[PDB]
Amino acid sequence: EMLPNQTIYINNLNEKIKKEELKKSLYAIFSQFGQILDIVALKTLKMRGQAFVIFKEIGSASNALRTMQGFPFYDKPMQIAYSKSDSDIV
RNA sequence: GGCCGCAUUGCACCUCGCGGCC
């Protein structure tokens, strides 16, 4: 099982949504959990449907993951895990 | 810049699947 990390990894995201909008919408629902350093969403073949939300505190990430797990975002239940590895900005 | 089709459920941190229309 994935250990806690201050970055959460989200997938099963609706790929039809433009990346800039996607990120603003994500910030709309995750900022309640604590300070966000950055949100990474790419639309490459490999990385579309996915995003990284990088919290300042690990406890924010844990709370965000547990609370928002499965929340239907642009119609699709978000799938949320901790990221495998630390995000670069540190 | 705007539409749309095919394929993709994928762990990233300098681009970066393919095709059609305006």
Side-chain angles (χ1 to χ4, degrees), chain A residues 9 22 28 41 47 60-61 75 78 82 85-86 88:
Chain A
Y9 166 79
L22 181 58
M47 293 316 293
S60 293
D75 303 328
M78 287 188 295
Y82 296 118
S85 296
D86 281 344
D88 285 347

Side-chain angles (χ1 to χ4, degrees), chain A residues 47-63:
Chain A
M47 293 316 293
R48 66 187 59 170
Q50 298 153 81
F52 295 80
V53 184
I54 309 168
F55 290 96
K56 181 172 162 181
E57 306 299 338
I58 295 186
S60 293
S62 287
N63 196 20

